[PDB]
Amino acid sequence: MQNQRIRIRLKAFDYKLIDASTAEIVETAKRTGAQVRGPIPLPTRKERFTVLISPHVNKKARDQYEIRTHKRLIDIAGVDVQISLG
Amino acid sequence: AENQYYGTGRRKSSAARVFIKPGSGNIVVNKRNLDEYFGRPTARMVVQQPLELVELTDKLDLYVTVKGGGISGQAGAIRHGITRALMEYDESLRPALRAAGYVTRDARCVERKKVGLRKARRRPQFS
Amino acid sequence: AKNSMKAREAKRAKLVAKFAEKRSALKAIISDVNASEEDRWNAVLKLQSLPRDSSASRQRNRCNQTGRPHGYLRKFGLSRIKVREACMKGEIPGLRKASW
Amino acid sequence: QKVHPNGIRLGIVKPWNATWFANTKDFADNLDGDFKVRQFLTGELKKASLSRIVIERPAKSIRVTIHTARPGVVDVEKLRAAVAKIAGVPAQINIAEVRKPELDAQLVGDSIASQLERRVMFRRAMKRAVQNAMRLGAKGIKVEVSGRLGGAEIARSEWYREGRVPLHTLRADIDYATSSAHTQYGVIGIKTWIFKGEILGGM
RNA sequence: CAACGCGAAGAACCUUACCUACUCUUGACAUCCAGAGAACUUUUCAGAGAUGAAUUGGUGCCUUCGGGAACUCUGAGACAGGUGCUGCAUGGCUGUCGUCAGCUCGUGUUGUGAAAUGUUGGGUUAAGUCCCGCAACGAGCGCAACCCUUAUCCUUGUUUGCCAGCGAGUAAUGUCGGGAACUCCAGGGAGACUGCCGGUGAUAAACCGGAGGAAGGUGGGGAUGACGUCAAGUCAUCAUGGCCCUUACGAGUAGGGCUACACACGUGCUACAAUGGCGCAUACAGAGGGCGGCCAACUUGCGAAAGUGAGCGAAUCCCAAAAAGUGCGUCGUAGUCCGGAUUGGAGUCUGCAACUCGACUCCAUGAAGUCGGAAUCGCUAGUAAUCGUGGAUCAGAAUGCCACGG
């Protein structure tokens, strides 16, 4: 019988909000009838941006920002759910 | 499992999974052989150094899987893997290996490039 | 930027959405390996005639909050200067200062 | 010279004014939307004591939060409708009272800014703010007014500090805000710091 | 010093601020007001183009129904516009001393007073660090800590990653059943405190050494820059007082230019060779990017590439090959099997367009250079040196820059 698991892929810029949401799901699935086999940390992306800090010159003067993106797989505002019934 | 002693060992960006078995000097690296993996001899010495010390060179079978880094990195990763493997066997093999600077994980890893610098330390030349 | 330099780029963006299909089609004749060399020339001819500003190459990505032509970043759409001022104020989500 | 107080503490003790996940495509549009929304709301709520516009994007929508000293002054339907237009997505607008509005760096500076635009003594405005804050229970406060002060031909920068303002302490809950008094002599900057006590335990 | 691979994280056009020429003045851009036309859509002539005049289809919304909108156009004058000037009128931002250990205040005391004291002194510390002394006693900004990362361990979980023990395969494949061990990934914890021992010192601070320990005395690196100094930089990111220009210092377009070169300097890259070149064989990374994107495979081409065709919005697919290394030959130490400039010629690719002025490929051409005066720069350890690799900007264009490992 063709398997139809629920590969959920949460993506967020905050790991605590992603963790709030991993609980939300797993809890609910457990508050119904569903095994989760879940939250599976997938490697956190880290975009980085070395911007010049001065309005004019001063090239060595520079700030470096990052946007880390956390991603969790559960295999049944800020969080990006992507349910994949396969 | 068998009498399969296991120890991890890291060095620079390399990580050796080192499995040890009662045996007769069968050193295996990533399904190649000790000398068939590392060429220049240092490496294979370095791997053996803790074996040479405990004096089980040809009383042991090494099933080493190592990833990451380079030759020296991997060599050193395994040395550290075996050190931990050897102390997984006899728990009072420590002082020998400890005092031979084998038990220490060498934390030294590449220093990051830094804005305004060519590298970690190297500055631009100046007028 | 000067208000005209901003205006020039609004127009360009208008003129690229307008002619995308036509340009792309023409270009996809100045190319087709098993096309006619004669029709190939006619495709070349029509693409000389379309408004130059309909070329997307002729767009300079500019800062959305100002119009700084240099120092751009696509992820955000702002110049370095505005990216920073936004980040510090906490207005770009996820983006903080980074050390490692 | 000095890092932005809100900048360094984002993630540590200071929350974000925008919470939405976007992938690169959308990210830059979402950012430009937010700017338009902020620029609009700020431009309308000039006499509503606005501090902080928090812009969520819950799925395909935009929730705003006008944190304000004057939930009364906020009309809301028109704002909701106007934001919904600019964003091009079903907008909500929520309101939050700034309960103690003289322990809010943004308002404190906006106050001083107004006062300096009405031609008040810069020392008078600065000093009253410091006192009100330290009375309402600021663990400290700095205010630095910079410009042509009392329309001086040479710009200077005066600042008063009462209490602690431990800027290098990251666990410190420091509220910062620049304002600008636009006057006949020129722009006059009002930086305001307000230390409301180190937050042990993280964010 | 703290300008000179700096603004510029990428000048063919665009960018662009400049120039020459052609063009327009309520204007390229904005609000207001009135009237007209939906918007738009072809297709066409002229022109370098901007624009102008001709050419068809469409003419919907919202209904008070002379109405809503909205867009287009023209007219009105208020206004618009200015990368014009002033950074010595400013805000904001930045460099610098320098992550140097300082800079100060309240109260008290001393002095006619400017002021002093605290903050000095004895030790100590990376540190105005700490401890003793002491008319000072307290406090603030700095120091340190709190943050990120990296060393080791535990716990929770296990796919797109893993493969110890598992059985079954394939030309090989973790291939695939299966495993949750391990590497790893990521959330939560543990750990380092001079805590412990010995010695030293004022029994102080602390210092020297030792044990344990992945780690030892701030473990390593990053972030974090006191009060101020230089009327330091930036009115050209933006903002802004004033000033100035408003048929022009505003606006549109086309072609030039910023790429010019007698030369000087700054910063780089590549060399001068055998610790090398060259051919062949063969091994080990980290990090990152990707939808008008990254492009597998196949076929074609010497090749750039082109056909052509998957997969992948990504621990899945792709970029993608590590290179220094190792193994074996060859060169035989010289202007060479060093070096790669320059130029001729034939191309590919991006783009409306590569003449000025792109990159790349192929063929040939094979310059300077034989380790560099005085002088001067960087570096104290996973550092320097060397080796490749990725990224932003980006149609195309990286010896720069940011970053990653060997």
Q: Per-residue DSSP letters for B55-100? A: T-TTSEEEEEEEESS-HHHHHHHHHHHHHHHHHHH-TT-HHHHHHT
Q: For C78, which residue in chain D has the nearest alpha carbon?
A: D28
Q: Report the Cα D161 to chain-centroid distance in Å.
A: 19
Q: Are D166 and D195 contacting, i.e. CB atoms less than 8 angstroms apart? A: yes
Q: Report the Cα D175 to chain-centroid distance in Å.
A: 8
- Provide the residue type at B48 as one letter: Q
Distance CA A27, CA B53 (A): 54
Strand, coil or helix: C72: strand
**What separation, in Å, do the N-terminal and C-terminal C-alpha atoms of chain A show?**
13
Q: Are D49 and D85 contacting, i.e. CB atoms less than 8 angstroms apart? A: no
Token duo for residue B38: 């590392």
* Residue tagged 């703010």 (tokens): D129
Q: Are A84 and A15 contacting, i.e. CB atoms less than 8 angstroms apart? A: no
Q: What is the DSSP string of A22-57?
A: HHHHHHHHHHTT------EEEEEEEEEEEEE-SSSS
In a mutational test of the A interface, the residue from C63, C75, C80, C100 whose CB has the highest number of chain A CBs within 10 Å is: C80
Q: Find the angle CA(A59)-CA(D188)-CA(D140) to the nearest 5 degrees.
A: 90
Sheet holding D187-198, edge to edge: D156-163, D140-147, D187-198, D172-182
D82: Cβ–Cβ under 8 A, 6 or more apart, which residues?
D40
DSSP label of C79: B
The approach used to solve this structure was cryo-EM
Quote the longest CA-to-CA distance of chain C: 60
Question: For chain D, how big is the Rg over CA atoms in Å?
Answer: 18
Q: What is the DSSP string of C5-53?
A: HHHHHHHHHHHHHHHHHHHHHHHTTSS-TTS-HHHHHHHHHHHHHS-GG
CA atoms within 13 A on the CB side of D75: 12
CA distance D9 to chain C (A): 9
A46 in B contact zone (CB under 8 Å): no
Distance CA D113, CA B32 (A): 75
Distance CA D8, CA A65 (A): 11
* Residue tagged 């970043």 (tokens): C73
Distance CA C92, CA A51 (A): 14
CA dihedral (B113, B115, B118, B124) in degrees, to 10, reads -150
* Residue tagged 């710091």 (tokens): D193
- Chain E footprint bases within 7 A of protein beta carbons: 1-17, 28-29, 41-42, 50, 81-84, 87, 89-99, 139-153, 157-160, 163-165, 181-188, 212-215, 219-229, 231, 233-234, 237-242, 250-254, 265-268, 283-292, 306-308, 313, 315-316, 322-327, 350-353, 377-386, 391-395, 401-406
- In 3D space, the residue among D146, D141, D107 whose CA is nearest the CA of residue D127 turns out to be D141
Distance CA C54, CA A1 (A): 54
Q: How far is CA A10 from CA A69, C14, D20, in A?
A: 10, 37, 13
DSSP label of C70: S
DSSP label of B110: P
DSSP label of C85: H
Token duo for residue B31: 């399904």
A64 in B contact zone (CB under 8 Å): yes
Q: Find the angle CA(B26)-CA(B28)-CA(B33) to the nearest 5 degrees.
A: 100
- Describe the crossing of helices B71-89 and B42-54 by its angle, rounded to 10 degrees: 10
| Element spanning D179, H or E | strand D172-182
- Pairing assessment for the beta strands D50-56 and D18-19 based on DSSP bridges: parallel
Contacts of A16 in chain D (CB under 8 A): 203
Distance CA B19, CA B23 (A): 12
C76 in D contact zone (CB under 8 Å): yes
B19: Cβ–Cβ under 8 A, 6 or more apart, which residues?
B4, B5, B6, B62, B63, B64, B65, B85
Question: Shortest CB distance from A11 goes to which of D19, D21, D56?
Answer: D21
Task: Say if residue D199 is exposed, middle or buried (CB neighbours under 10 Å; 0-12, 13-18, 19+).
Answer: middle
CA distance D121 to chain A (A): 32
- Pairing assessment for the beta strands B26-29 and B60-67 based on DSSP bridges: parallel
Q: Are A26 and A39 contacting, i.e. CB atoms less than 8 angstroms apart? A: yes
